[model samples]
Target: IVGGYTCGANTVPYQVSLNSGYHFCGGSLINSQWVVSAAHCYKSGIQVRLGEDNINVVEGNEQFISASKSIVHPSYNSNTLNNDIMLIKLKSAASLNSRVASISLPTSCASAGTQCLISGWGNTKSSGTSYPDVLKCLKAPILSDSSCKSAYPGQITSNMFCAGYLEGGKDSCQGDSGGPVVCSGKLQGIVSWGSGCAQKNKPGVYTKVCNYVSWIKQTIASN
Candidate 1:
C-alpha cells in the first residue's frame, strides 16, 4: 500500500501474501481453502502465506501453504487488465483464529469518494524496486468511473474501478497487486493495476468485486 504505515497484527487477518520464492503479490482469504487475488499476479510455483504480518520472517501465527490449484477468470485480459481476478485453492484448510480469518464480500457496490483501506508488502516508492519486510496499510478514497476515466481514458471498464489520489502520493504500488481494497468494512475491490505508483492523476485501478460476486460464488462452489 502507498504512503502508509505499519498496521496492527491481526487487524487484517484475511490479508495474505502471494509468493513465488519471494513476495510478489497480496491476496485475501475468502474461506478456509479459497483465496482471492489478481489473475495477473499468477506465475508458476506460487504459494500462499496466511496469518502473516511480516514477510521476511516466520512468525508463530503464520501458515505457509501450497496452492493446490489456481483458476484465473476465463475472460481475464492481461493486456488491458480487464477482469483481472483469480482464485486459488489451498492444499489444506487454513487454521482460523484471531490471527487468521476470511474477509466478507460486499453486498452492494462501493460508492464513489468513500474512504477505503489497502494493505500490502509493495514497494515504498515508484522507481524503487524494493519491497517492505512487513505488510503496510494505507487509506485512500474511491474515485468515480468518470473521474477515473479522465485519468485512464478508455481503460476503465465495468469490471474495474479506481481508487487513490488525483494529486498523487498514496496508492497501491507495484508488488501490491491482488490485495484487498476494503470499503465500509467490506471487500469492495482487488488491487489489479496502475500506470505508475502514486503518480499524479493516475489512480490505482482495481477489480470491482461486486461485479463478480456471482462468478466468485460459482467458482468457489464448483471448485
Candidate 2:
C-alpha cells in the first residue's frame, strides 16, 4: 500500500499479505478455484497470502499459493497499458466454505458513472506510505466512457472500465495493481493502472469483469 491510501473499516472484502514484510494488492476469490487480479501484481513475485484476519501470518489458515500459470491479455500493450489484465491459476483450490468464499461476478455490469468499491493495501495517505500487512478499501464511482477515454486517451478500450476518486488524494498505487473494484457487492472490475496514484483528472483503471465473463468461464472449465 505504498500509493498513499489505507485499509477501510471493511477490509475483510480484500485479502491482506504479511509475507516479505510488505503489502501487495489482490482479490479474494471468484469461484472455488479461480482468483482474479491485475497482471502487475506478478511484478512483485507470485508468493502471497489471503485471509480475513491479520492472523494469516501466525495461523496456517492463510493459504500460501504460487501462480502455477498466468495469461496476460494478448492485446495487452504495456506502453499504453491496453488490456492490462491476467488470471492466476493457483496450485491448489482454496477453501470456499469458511471465512473466505468466492465473490459473485456481475452478469451484466453497469455503464459509466456507476458507484463501485475499490479495495487494496495501497498508500493509506497521499504523500504517505503503503500498509505492510494490512489491507485497505474505498468507495469510488465509475467513470463515464467519455470521461475515461478523455482521462486515459491512449488505451481504455471497451474491455476496461475506470473507477476511483476524482478528489486527487486517494488512489491505488503500484502494489495495488492486481486487485478488485467491486460494486453492488458484485465483482465488476480488477484494478489495473492510472496516470498516478489517485490524481484528479486520472481515474483508476480496471479490467471489466463483464467483458471477460466468457473467457473466465472457458478458462476455468478447461483447467
Candidate 3:
C-alpha cells in the first residue's frame, strides 16, 4: 500500500489473509464459514487466516482455516475483471470474538466520495518487491462510475468501481488483490485489480460488493 500505515491490532477483525504457501491475497470474513475475495485469487487448496495482524509474527489470536469450497461468480469475466468476486467456504466455522468477526455487507450502494478503508499485506511501494509484515490500511475515497470509466475507458465494467487518490499517493498493491475495502464499517468493496499500485488518474479498482449482495446470499444459501 503506497502511503499507507499499519492498522491497529484487531481493528480490522473481518480482514483475512488468503495463502497458498505465503500471503498471496487478502479476503474479508463475511460469516463464520464464508469469506469473500476476488475471483482471480481463487485456488484449489487455499488457507484462510483470521485475526492476523502481522504475517511475520505468530499472533496467538490468529485462526487458521482451510477452504472447503470456492465459488466464483458465474458472470465473472477474467479479461475485463467484471464481477471479479468469489466466495470461499471454510472447512469449519470461525469462532467469532473481539479479535475475529464478520463484517456486514453494505445495506445500500456506497455513494461516490464516501471515504473507505482498505487493508491488506500487499506491496508497500509501486516499484520493486516489498511487502509489509504488518497489515497495511489506506484511506481512499470512492470514485464515480463516470470518473472511473474515464480513468480506464472500456475497462471499467458494471460490477467494478475505482477508489484511491487521483494524485497517486496511496492504494492496494499486487498482493492486496482480494482484500477488504470497508466503507463506513461495512464490506463495500473487494480489492480486485488496477493499472499499477497508485498512479495518477489510475486509482485502484475494486469489485463493487453492493452489486453482488443477492448473489452472495444465494451462493451461501445454496452451498
Candidate 4:
C-alpha cells in the first residue's frame, strides 16, 4: 500500500482476494474458473472473492467462490523459492461482466527497464500489520536479471525476476503475495517474495509468468 494510489474498482477486473478467514494473498483471474497466484502464498481453507475493491465492506458486485483444488508446480522448490507459482481451480466458474473479467497472460517476456504496475491490499509500511481496505497500486521498473542476481546473490533464478525502485519507498509487502504485476497489458509477473518492504536496493522479486505458460496451460487442461 505504500506509495500507491487507490485504483478504480473495475480497473483490474481480474484481480481477486484469496481469503482464508481474511485476505491472505492476492491473485489474478485468468479465466472463469482459474486463478493464478504465488505458490508460497498457499494455505488451507482458501477462497476467492472477485469484483471486490474494498475488503472491509461487502459490495454488490462481489462474487465469492470456493477453491476446488490448488495445483502447485511439480518442480516447485520451496527452500530455494523456485517455481513459486500456482493455479487455483474454482469450485464454480465466475460470472463475467464489466466488474469481473479475465486478464491476458504474457505471450513473451517483459524486457528489462520496462515499467509495470502492481496492485494489492497488503501492508502500507514494512513494520505494520495493517492492510488497506481498498486495492492499492504502484509503478515499478523491471530490472535486469543480472542486476537482480547481484542484489540477491544466487537466490535469483531464471524463473524469477525483480522490479522496484533502487531508491526505495515503493514496493509490495506482507499480504501482497500472489498479486499481479502487469506489464504492457499482459500478466507478466506474480508477487513472489522480497526482503523488507521498499528497502533500498532490495527490489521486490516475482515469479516470471511468461516462463511457465506451458505448464500453466497443461495443468489447466489436465485438471
Each model's TM-score? Answer: 0.97, 0.83, 0.98, 0.97
For model 2, the superposed segments whose C-alpha errors exceed 4 Å read: 1-23, 43-45, 52-61, 128-132
Question: Which parts of model 4 have CA positions greater than 4 angstroms off?
Answer: none
- The models' CA-based lDDT, in order, is 0.90, 0.65, 0.91, 0.91
Candidate 1 C-alpha lDDT tens digits along 134-197: 8899998899889999998888998888898899888898888999999888899999989889
Q: What pairs collide in candidate 3?
A: 1-123
lDDT of 3: 0.91
In model 2, state the lDDT of residue 178: 72
The per-prediction tally of clashing pairs is 0, 15, 1, 0
Best by TM-score: 3
Angstrom error of the Cα, residue 148, model 3: value is 0.8
Worst 10 residues of 4 by lDDT: 123-132
Give the lowest summed-lDDT range of ten residues in model 2: 1-10
TM-score of 3: 0.98
What's model 1's overall lDDT?
Answer: 0.90
Residue 203's lDDT in candidate 2: 68
Model 1: per-residue Cα lDDT at residue 49 = 94
